[PDB]
Amino acid sequence: HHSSGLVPRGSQILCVGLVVLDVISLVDKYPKEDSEIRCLSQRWQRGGNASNSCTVLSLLGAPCAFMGSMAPGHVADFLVADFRRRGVDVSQVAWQSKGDTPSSCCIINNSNGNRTIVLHDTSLPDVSATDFEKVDLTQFKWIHIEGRNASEQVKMLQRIDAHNTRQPPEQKIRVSVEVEKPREELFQLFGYGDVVFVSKDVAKHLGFQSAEEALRGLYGRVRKGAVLVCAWAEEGADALGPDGKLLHSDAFPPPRVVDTLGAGDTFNASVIFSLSQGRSVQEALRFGCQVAGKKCGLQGFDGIV
Amino acid sequence: PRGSQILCVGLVVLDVISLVDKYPKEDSEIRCLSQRWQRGGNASNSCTVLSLLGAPCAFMGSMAPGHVADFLVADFRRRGVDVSQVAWQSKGDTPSSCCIINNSNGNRTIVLHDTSLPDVSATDFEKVDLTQFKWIHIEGRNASEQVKMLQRIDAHNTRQPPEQKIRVSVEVEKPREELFQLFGYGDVVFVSKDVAKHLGFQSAEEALRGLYGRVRKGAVLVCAWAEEGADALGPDGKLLHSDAFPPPRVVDTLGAGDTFNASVIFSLSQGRSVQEALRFGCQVAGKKCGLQGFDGIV
Ligand SMILES: OC[C@H]1CCN1c1nc(-c2cnn(C3CCNCC3)c2)cc(C(F)(F)F)n1
Numbered sequence: 001h002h003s004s005g006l007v008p009r010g011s012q013i014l015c016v017g018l019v020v021l022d023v024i025s026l027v028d029k030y031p032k033e034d035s036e037i038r039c040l041s042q043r044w045q046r047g048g049n050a051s052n053s054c055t056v057l058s059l060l061g062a063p064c065a066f067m068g069s070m071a072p073g074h075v076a077d078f079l080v081a082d083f084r085r086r087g088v089d090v091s092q093v094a095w096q097s098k099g100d101t102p103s104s105c106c107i108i109n110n111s112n113g114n115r116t117i118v119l120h121d122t123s124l125p126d127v128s129a130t131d132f133e134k135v136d137l138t139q140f141k142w143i144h145i146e147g148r149n150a151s152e153q154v155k156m157l158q159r160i161d162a163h164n165t166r167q168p169p170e171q172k173i174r175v176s177v178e179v180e181k182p183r184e185e186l187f188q189l190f191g192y193g194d195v196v197f198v199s200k201d202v203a204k205h206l207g208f209q210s211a212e213e214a215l216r217g218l219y220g221r222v223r224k225g226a227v228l229v230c231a232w233a234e235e236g237a238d239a240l241g242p243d244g245k246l247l248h249s250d251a252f253p254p255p256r257v258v259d260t261l262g263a264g265d266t267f268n269a270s271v272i273f274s275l276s277q278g279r280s281v282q283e284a285l286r287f288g289c290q291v292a293g294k295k296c297g298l299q300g301f302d303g304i305v
Numbered sequence: 306p307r308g309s310q311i312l313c314v315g316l317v318v319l320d321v322i323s324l325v326d327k328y329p330k331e332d333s334e335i336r337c338l339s340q341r342w343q344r345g346g347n348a349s350n351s352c353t354v355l356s357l358l359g360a361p362c363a364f365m366g367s368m369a370p371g372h373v374a375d376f377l378v379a380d381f382r383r384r385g386v387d388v389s390q391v392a393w394q395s396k397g398d399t400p401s402s403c404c405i406i407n408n409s410n411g412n413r414t415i416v417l418h419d420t421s422l423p424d425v426s427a428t429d430f431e432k433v434d435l436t437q438f439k440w441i442h443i444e445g446r447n448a449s450e451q452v453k454m455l456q457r458i459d460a461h462n463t464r465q466p467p468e469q470k471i472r473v474s475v476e477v478e479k480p481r482e483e484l485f486q487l488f489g490y491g492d493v494v495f496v497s498k499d500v501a502k503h504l505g506f507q508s509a510e511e512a513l514r515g516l517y518g519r520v521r522k523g524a525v526l527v528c529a530w531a532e533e534g535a536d537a538l539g540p541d542g543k544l545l546h547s548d549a550f551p552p553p554r555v556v557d558t559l560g561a562g563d564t565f566n567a568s569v570i571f572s573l574s575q576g577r578s579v580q581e582a583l584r585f586g587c588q589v590a591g592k593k594c595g596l597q598g599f600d601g602i603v
C-alpha cells in the first residue's frame with residue numbers, strides 16, 4: 001500500500017459504522033416492473049450514518065476518522081475519494097476480501113417526492129471486535145459508534161472502557177453510541193457510552209409518542225452518569241442526564257426545506273462536536289438543532305457552517 | 306485482418322445492477338440479494354456475446370474519459386473487444402443506469418441516465434477503415450447521422466467484388482419515428498416487439514408482414530417476441546419461425562435481446578441459413594436468461 005501521517009495523540013473524533021454508495025435517481029413516474037425509463041437526474045452520493053457524521057465533523061473543523069468495512073473495487077475508490085474530498089481520515093477502514101462494498105439504489109418520484117429504495121446487500125462483514133482490538137486508541141479523543149453488529153460492538157465498547165480505566169481524566173476517551181434502527185439486538189447498546197442517541201423511529205417503535213416520553217421511559221437503560229439524547233425532527237430535540245432534568249431545544253427550520261436527508265447525522269455530529277469542545281449539554285443540544293436546521297435548507301452538506 | 310472482424314456501433318453504459326427477490330412497491334424499501342456492475346448498452350452487450358462466441362469483434366461508440374470509462378474499457382479488453390474506434394468525447398459523463406433484476410422471473414427494470422454525451426457522427430464514421438470488417442451492426446439512435454454511415458457502407462460495397470462485400474445489420478429497438486428510415490438499409494433488419502406493438506402489430510408474424518414493405522430489396526426482417534421465440538421474413542416471402550429455448554428458471558433477461566441479435570449475426574456471418582441463425586439466436590438468448598450476466602452461455 002503506502003503510508004499515513006502522524007496524528008497528534010488525543011486529537012481525532014472517530015465514527016464507526018456504515019458507509020454506502022447511494023445511486024439516487026429522480027424520475028417522472030415510478031417505473032413499472034420490466035420497463036426501461038430515462039431519469040430526470042442521477043447522483044452518486046456517499047451515505048451511511050457514521051459516514052455522514054464524519055463529513056459534518058470535518059466541516060465543523062474537527063480532525064475526524066471513519067472506521068467501517070469496504071471491499072477493494074471501484075465502489076470503494078469512489079467512496080474513499082469522496083471521504084478525502086470532505087477531509088476525512090480513512091486509515092482505519094477495515095478492508096475485506098469477501099463481499100461487496102454496500103451500494104443502494106434510491107428512486108425519487110418527481111411527482112409526489114416519494115422514495116423507493118433497493119437497499120445494499122449484506123455480503124460485506126461488519127468490523128469485528130477482533131479487528132477493533134488491533135487499533136491503537138490514543139490518537140482519538142472521542143469515539144462514536146453507530147449501532148449495527150451490537151454483540152461485537154459491545155466488546156469494542158468494553159475495550160474502550162478498559163483503556164479509560166488506566167487513563168488520567170484528561171486522556172479519557174469520550175464515547176457515544178447511536179441506536180437508530182428499531183432492531184432488538186441494538187437495545188443492549190443503551191447501556192454503553194457517555195452519550196446515547198436514540199432515534200424518533202426507535203422511540204415510536206417502542207410506543208413512545210414524544211421525545212419527553214422516550215427519554216423518561218428509556219433513561220433507566222443507560223449507564224450511570226450517561227446523557228440520553230432524542231431528536232424529534234421539526235419538534236427539535238431533548239436530552240436527559242443524571243440530574244434528572246429534561247433539557248429541550250426547539251428546531252431552527254430554514255426559510256425553505258430543501259433536503260432533510262442526513263439531518264439526523266448532522267445533529268448527532270454537531271452535538272458530539274459541541275460536547276467535545278467542552279460545552280454544556282444544553283448548549284450542545286441547541287447547537288445540534290441549529291446546524292441540522294440549517295442543513296435542511298441546503299442540498300447535501302455544502303454551506304452547513 | 307481484412308474483413309475478419311464484426312463491428313458494432315451503438316451505446317456502452319455502466320449497468321449498476323441489483324438482484325432482488327421481488328420488485329419493490331412504490332414508496333417501500335427492500336434489500337437486494339446481490340449487487341454487481343456490468344458493462345452494458347445494446348451494441349456493447351452484443352460485443353460481449355460475439356466475443357464469447359469466438360468472433361473477433363470491435364465496438365464503436367462515445368465514451369468520456371473518467372473512472373467509469375476505465376472500468377468499461379478494462380471490461381472490453383478482458384473480453385478481447387477492440388476499442389480502437391471509440392469516439393472519445395471531452396464534453397459529458399459516461400451514461401449509467403440502475404438495473405433492478407427480479408430473480409423470480411428475470412424481469413429487468415432499467416433507470417437510464419442519459420448524460421447528453423454526443424453520439425457517434427457520420428464524420429467519426431468517415432475516419433473508420435472499413436476493410437477490417439466482414440459485418441457491421443448499427444444500433445439505431447441518431448438516425449440521419451447513421452443513415453450517412455450506412456450510405457457510406459453501400460458506396461464502399463459497390464467498389465467491391467461480391468467476394469468481399471460488407472454485410473450490414475440495423476436494430477430499430479426504441480419506438481421513435483426518427484428511426485423508421487433505418488428499415489431501408491442493411492441486409493438484416495432487427496425490429497423489436499416494443500416497436501411492433503407500438504405500430505399496432507400483435508405478433509411477430511403480423512409485424513413482419515406489416516413492415517416488410519419498408520426494407521430494401523433483398524433484406525431479411527427479423528422480429529423476436531420474447532418467450533414466443535422469433536420470426537424472420539426474407540425476399541422469398543416465406544415466414545420463418547423458431548420456438549424459444551426457455552431455461553426451467555428464468556433469472557436474468559437483461560441483455561437477452563442483444564444476445565439474440567449477436568447470435569443471429571454470428572450465425573449468418575458463418576454462412577448458416579436464416580432458419581438456422583434464428584434458432585441459434587433463440588438458443589443462446591434462452592441459455593443467457595437462465596444465468597446472471599453473460600459468462601457461461603457457451
Ligand atoms: O433531524 C434532527 C432534528 C433536531 C433538529 N432537527 C431537524 N430535523 C428536521 C427533519 C428530520 N427529518 N425530517 C423529515 C421531514 C419529512 N417528514 C419526516 C421527517 C425533518 C427538520 C428540522 C427543522 F426543519 F425543523 F428545522 N430540524
Ligand SMILES: OC[C@H]1CCN1c1nc(-c2cnn(C3CCNCC3)c2)cc(C(F)(F)F)n1
Binds near residue numbers: 561
Ligand atoms: O429476447 C430475444 C428472444 C428470442 C428468444 N428470446 C428470449 N427472450 C426472452 C425474454 C425477453 N424479455 N423477456 C421478459 C420476461 C418477463 N415478461 C416480459 C418480457 C423474456 C426470454 C426467452 C426465453 F426464456 F423464453 F427463452 N427467450
